[PDB]
From a paper:
[name]-1 hijacks a host ubiquitin ligase complex using a [name], Vif, to degrade the antiviral factor, [name] (A3G). A3G is a human, single-stranded DNA (ssDNA) deaminase that catalyzes fatal mutations in genomes of viruses such as [name]-1 [Reviewed in 6–9]. Here we show reconstitution of the A3G-Vif complex and subsequent A3G ubiquitination in vitro and report the cryo-EM structure of the A3G-Vif complex at 2.8 Å resolution using solubility-enhanced variants of A3G and Vif. In summary, our high-resolution cryo-EM structure of sA3G-VC-RNA20 revealed that Vif binds sA3G through interactions with ssRNA.
Numbering used by the authors:
A (entry chain I), I (entry chain E): 8 to 74, 80 to 111, 161 to 172
B (entry chain B), H (entry chain A): -1 to 178
C (entry chain D), G (entry chain H): 17 to 74, 83 to 128
D (entry chain J), J (entry chain F): 27 to 31, 37 to 59, 63 to 74, 95 to 115, 120 to 127
E (entry chain C), F (entry chain G): 3 to 112, 160 to 176
Write the structure that this text describes.
RNA sequence: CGGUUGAUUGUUUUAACAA
RNA sequence: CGGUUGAUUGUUUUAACAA
């Protein structure tokens, strides 16, 4: 798995914007938000599922990494059991095609 | 000692998961060690609310700096706070306690803020290692805050439903976090 | 009023009570060495304070040479229409000592 | 690459690699994460990236690692 | 090193504010003390003077000067504010105790209470 | 979608605080309104109820419920706090205007002023 | 009291007055679509407000289907011991309209 | 409108170089554009002091957020501040003004904070480019603040020595900074 | 000249500690502090002269650098007209031999 | 090394180098500063460092620079 | 996202405004 | 560093404490 080092403030802004756009703005209401307690991995902060046709794009935010504790983001395309690591550049187009500032993977992932 | 009962009841509710308490209220009192006994400071106690950019811990630090406490005396500071201190607040309180060895701090928390977050866990552990005492606010300190910091106008304290169960659950969570 | 100060009176320095004792000693030594900083001595039993403002801010002296580890203070002042003197001394370590009024 | 986590650091690296049940980080802000399978020195890992099945192989004493299809 | 010696009575911030507000109220709203001159802090060469009230008594004047940013006191709330009262005539100044100052004020001049130096300077933390 | 309809009089924060303090003062300090029941905000299933005052009138009760965190009003200081007054008897509730509520209070019950609903609910920003 | 509301009365929506008008329209549409959020309508000339709390918080309806670009509101309530109805309508664009009391 | 005269005289002294003014005082007033005329808001005006970690600009931003100003109305906000905003304060005010186009801001400064610092110069220039009007507080606005925000109890305003000279010098410095 | 990129907060802490130790603490009272207006270079924030016997160590803080405006520190030993660029490691010993935390070049310069 | 200050950036580099009266930065947080003499592409600069007279020489299109005694 | 609230949703943040 | 103040020195930061 590829994890990009990110500050906690950017993670908080990302999760706040995601919650806003699936609940209040409802522009991304089709998305799913999985909390920490629904994940078996103790290091996973949160999961964001973006439905893309049959497939789905999963953005997983991690906390408690020893990179002194660090946080990270992992983008992963999922076609049923099939999975693939995705760079932010591909995720930008993948989100723009099928879909407060909009929640963009590039802004959160960029250093 | 000027706090309306509605604010206290809303903010100091001890339910472990409370989603619409966006402000942090911190009541503080200071005691001085004189002749081997801890005498309360009547005018060195109060309560402060929170701002989006200014947390109550920073305001209390500024108040302590303005108080000009004698360095040759021992002070014991009791806190009653609705949310447990965040990472930045715990960090700053830890370094302040390290730089101020003549004052000790005990903290009672109505709720644990992000008790499932590893970052908040290490912040709380560092604050505890700095010498601060972290406790869960039970019915006794709730009544003490009602009769001391709350402008109840003589009204008796009315505990909310499930106060003891929430207190026990938060005590267990705090014991797990602090690795007692 | 005069008798209360003349009979029993003790003075102490509390310029920086939030700082460590060594830093307090250093600050007091500096303020006594150069006349660019005020020095205040508080009566222990009351709120009375004797402040030595520099002459630029408006036979009175503060000195260390009389005794090692001690500060001696002489302050003539006209109080209630009668001239009086304030004689005091505080030692370096404890920043405490004896100060009292006399007739000159 | 470089490990992120001196004698205590290398002892932790060694016992974490020998026993497992922990996460291992290798930064390049790109970083490779090694998680235990229950949560779901030479390093070799098959991983699908951008639709192709690339394999990341490297070594650490600091070290060097690269991905090849 | 030349020094200027003044007897300053340490008084907490609340009493200083109450004294200032009472004096200003009795100078303009209830003009009983309308002859009192209130000189501000920027008119004095002393950098640690907060306020200065001049009370004309005959051909002399009773000056009550309140200081801020002084050295901390022994008590908790003696944070660096004080009051010094003096009586000056023809460039001859003598320090005056608060009781004598109040006696002079009541001799020459005499609901919100009237401004009294004794209440301002009294130490409520030492008794 | 099923809705519950209530007439809420928008009142600024200062008047809400004054009403609460006056009611609590007359409940415990000056026990003229000692029969009034003050139910706190956590005893109501409505998440936007700040306070609830029960006034027994015979076998019925006049309930004055103050709400916080409502929608903003047209005026500047209608920031989301309001008051609704109703009269209930045997699970039959009817909304009551503030004037009628004050008339009932003075009929059954009647220095800090006595708590009046008309003063609390009157709009000082629209007149 | 009844005549003041019955004779002349106009209502408007001011739920989020600090937000742009399009966001206000979207928020009002959402709150009307799902009965999980309160909707308040303020009389322009007074401080009177009609609040439609969800039934979970304790023949009254809010609807959009009657006319495109309009919201129709029916609220029966017992006021001062007599049952009355509140009939209102506000259009989508301006978040404003007419609302008044009648006898049912 | 509750400000003691001593605080105003000490903090709002307009000497360009003032070394012992460690706190920032900001008086604010708001006007609303109704029927083509600007009507003053009597209850939307006041004054706020500064904290070591909390600047008055952030407190004013929080107050504006709490005010719930209508987005369909034009607001004109006048500031009278003892020190010109720092880099962080100018940054935050610039982004707030960019995100709030329905409100305009005019600022009068008693003194220019670090007017020789290039960082503060670019901060002030960015704040001006964001739409804020920066002016030097002359005798007229000093008298206005004395009669409006200062609890003078009817006492007349007493200007300090060299007020006009300091105002002219600060006007020249501000003109040089803003590249008029 | 060698300039190390530093945040403005560290520069402020350095200048505050230097002023403290030459004025109040008087542990470094022999040092000299040259302000911006006494320097011909418009980019110089401040200068700190540390007398080291006959020679002197000059620490110059710069602002307004286009590195978007950046600040920097330059350490330079001076023996009369002779001058030399000095790394923080040598300056540590040079200060410790002849002389709130103490003002250390390494802490300010380190990234 | 790399210049710190795209078309506007290179135009500013060019005219600043041609005319002068400005500071030029070259980061490696070590950085080389070129100041006009009145304040007191190939790059060459004599400079005394740690008691020795080293000479720093480099080139920029980004670039490469090194110091040699 | 006023809910088996996972907590920066529309903040509930205020010593006297009716002494 | 209360000074030809170059400004995070010992902050001067407070609506009623004597209504
Ligand atoms: Zn916090
Ligand atoms: Zn600022």
């Amino acid at each position: 798995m590829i994890v990009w080092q990110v500050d906690r403030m950017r993670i908080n802004t990302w999760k706040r914007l995601v919650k806003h756009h699936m609940y209040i703005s409802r522009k991304a209401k089709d998305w799913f938000y999985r909390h920490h307690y629904e994940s078996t991995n103790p290091k996973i902060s949160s999961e964001v599922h973006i439905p893309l046709g049959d497939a789905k794009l999963v953005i997983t935010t991690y906390w408690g990494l020893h990179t002194h504790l660090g946080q990270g983001v992992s983008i992963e395309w999922r076609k049923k059991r099939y999975s693939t690591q995705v760079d932010p550049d591909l995720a930008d187009q993948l989100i723009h095609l099928h879909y407060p500032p909009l929640p963009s993977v590039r802004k959160l992932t960029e250093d | 000692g000027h706090m309306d009962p509605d604010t206290f009841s809303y903010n100091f509710n001890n339910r472990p998961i409370l989603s619409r308490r966006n402000t942090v209220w911190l009541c503080y009192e200071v005691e001085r060690l004189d002749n081997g006994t801890w005498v309360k400071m009547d005018q060195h106690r109060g309560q402060v609310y929170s701002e989006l950019k200014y947390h109550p811990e920073m305001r209390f630090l500024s108040l302590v700096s303005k108080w000009k406490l004698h360095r040759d005396q021992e002070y014991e500071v009791t806190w009653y706070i609705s949310w447990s201190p965040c990472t930045k607040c715990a960090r700053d309180m830890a370094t302040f306690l390290q730089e101020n060895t003549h004052v000790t701090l005990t903290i009672f928390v109505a709720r644990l803020y992000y008790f499932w977050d590893p970052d908040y866990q290490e912040a709380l552990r560092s604050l505890a290692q700095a010498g601060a005492t972290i406790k869960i606010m039970n019915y006794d300190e709730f009544q003490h805050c009602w009769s001391k910091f709350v402008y109840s106008q003589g009204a008796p304290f009315q505990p909310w439903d499930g106060l003891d169960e929430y207190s026990q659950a938060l005590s267990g969570m705090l014991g797990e976090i602090l690795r007692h | 009023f005069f008798r209360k100060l003349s009979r029993e009176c003790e003075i102490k320095y509390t310029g920086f009570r939030d700082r460590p004792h060594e830093e307090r000693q250093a600050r007091f030594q500096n303020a006594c060495r150069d006349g660019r900083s005020e020095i205040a001595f508080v009566a222990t039993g009351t709120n009375l304070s004797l402040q030595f403002f520099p002459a630029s801010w408006q036979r009175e002296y503060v000195d260390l040479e009389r005794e090692a580890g001690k500060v001696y203070l002489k302050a003539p002042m006209i109080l209630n229409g009668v001239c009086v003197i304030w004689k005091g001394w505080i030692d370096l370590q404890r920043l405490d000592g004896m100060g009292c009024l006399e007739f000159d | 690459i470089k490990y992120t986590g001196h004698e205590e650091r290398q002892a932790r690296f060694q016992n974490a690699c020998r026993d497992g049940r922990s996460e291992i980080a290798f930064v390049a802000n790109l970083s490779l994460q090694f998680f235990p399978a229950s949560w779901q020195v030479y390093l070799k890992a098959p991983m699908i990236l951008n639709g192709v099945c690339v394999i990341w192989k490297g070594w650490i004493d600091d070290g060097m690692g690269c991905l090849e299809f």
